[PDB]
């Protein structure tokens, strides 16, 4: 199915310091492949997957200089915004930037995006085509007018449709063994009596890739939703993911309940029951 | 691969 290349950037001002902390990560789907951290000794984009180590020093020199440009750009933005909002130097403020590609199962361009935040609220962002901007407030409205004169959006659009996609298409081929793998969930169920006439059924999905997964409980076929505790899908640490869903039921009615597991990896959906 | 001509505010 679909695949995406998403880069994330975070700069946080340190008033008790000179320089902002700056962190950049690059994902392909749910798999991180690069990082930069201002506080890491390196001062270079470091690989974080085996299929990116493959690239020559030409590549790395470029990624390092462009990430340095992002770092320096966020530096001046922190300053500019502080001024637009008449905020003192004593406060710690944050900017965030997220951009990238989506492609379809036919690896062609589906969608692009580029969004900017100040202190965790939307500042300015590209609309769904990539020709205009949504400005949150009156500060962002001056940023819009300024970017419109300079054809900021056009240059961005050329990257998002186009080169971002071309690079995604490349990473998917070179990393084929990991990125185009699916790994079906391994599953089990646990039954723990809560109180004296009531028990918790918890249904587990472990070791699956990608992270997209549905885990639902049904009672006689009806889908519990108000009554299910569901935890956010979480990284295993070995490039796989984990979720669980729980529900509390009257004891002796456990047979009426079934867990349903939907995942790209599984041919047909699994259905687990409470079986000793 | 990262974008080159990232703009300032």
């Amino acid at each position, epitope marked *: 199915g679909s695949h995406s290349m998403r880069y994330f950037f975070t700069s946080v001002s340190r008033p008790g310091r000179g320089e902002p902390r700056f962190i950049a990560v690059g994902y392909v789907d749910d798999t991180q492949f690069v990082r930069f951290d201002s506080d890491a000794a390196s001062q270079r984009m470091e690989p974080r997957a085996p299929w990116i180590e493959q690239e020559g020093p*030409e*590549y790395w020199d*470029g990624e390092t*200089r*462009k990430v*340095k*440009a992002h770092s*320096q*750009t966020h530096r*001046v933005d922190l300053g500019t915004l502080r001024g637009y909002y008449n905020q003192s130097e004593a406060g710690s403020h944050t900017v965030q930037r997220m951009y990238g590609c989506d492609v379809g199962s036919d690896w062609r361009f589906l969608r692009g995006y580029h969004q900017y935040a100040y202190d965790g609220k939307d500042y300015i962002a590209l609309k769904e085509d990539l020709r205009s901007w949504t400005a949150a407030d009156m500060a962002a409205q001056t940023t819009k007018h*300024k*970017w419109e004169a*300079a*054809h*900021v959006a*056009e*240059q961005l*659009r*050329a*990257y998002l449709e*186009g*080169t971002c996609v*071309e690079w995604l298409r490349r990473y998917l081929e070179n990393g084929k063994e990991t990125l185009q793998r699916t790994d079906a969930p391994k599953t089990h169920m646990t039954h723990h009596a809560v109180s004296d006439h009531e028990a918790t059924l918890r249904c587990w999905a472990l070791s699956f890739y990608p992270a997209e997964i549905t885990l639902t409980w049904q009672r006689d076929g009806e889908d519990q939703t108000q009554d299910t505790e569901l935890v956010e899908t979480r990284p295993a640490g070995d490039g796989t993911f984990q979720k669980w869903a729980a529900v509390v039921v009257p004891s002796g009615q456990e047979q009426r309940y079934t867990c349903h597991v939907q995942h790209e990896g599984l041919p047909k959906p699994l259905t687990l029951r409470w079986e000793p | *691969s990262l*974008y*080159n*001509t990232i*703009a*300032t505010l």
Partner: T-cell receptor
Amino acid sequence: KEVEQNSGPLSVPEGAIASLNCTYSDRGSQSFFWYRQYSGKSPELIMFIYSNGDKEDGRFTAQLNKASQYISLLIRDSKLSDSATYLCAVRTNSGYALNFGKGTSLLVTP
Amino acid sequence: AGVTQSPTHLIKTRGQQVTLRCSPKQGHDTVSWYQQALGQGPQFIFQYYEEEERQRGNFPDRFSGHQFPNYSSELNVNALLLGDSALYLCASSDTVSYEQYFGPGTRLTVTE
């Protein structure tokens, strides 16, 4: 060399459409410019193009085609003062440098 | 207000050094240097932003640069060869459009 264009001279009759091409090989190539340089002077940017297709600007039309990897420039209604060398430059996504062609010399004949 | 450069012409003997100046356009802060040999395209030497060599071309150690805190720049070359004879172009840009604009140049002729 990365960006290729013919030296010329192109000879064009005054009034008639001049026509310059430029081909490049790096698929990273993302932004494109035409500069004009008169004898003994600096290059001056006459057009930038960022998106596939045509862009018209008065007498000048630039044509980018990323699949085939060319950029053309057409000068409609050629004047004598259009006699100059036309350089094309590409900027690839890997960095901030402009990469240039030799330049094509254009003589407009009266 | 436009990009400025100096000197406009120079004659240097081989093995000497030279030092070319460039001031960017008002409102621009990045400068790139380029070498233009006669009848040929400008070749990127290097680009300076926030007083640091942001990126370098195919030019060896003996070409060094500097960018001052006003955003102006110096290109120093030493151990001049006859091969260094060229139009040294300086180009300025902002960090919004990134459009590069050239100054007049410095015409260097190196003779033995």
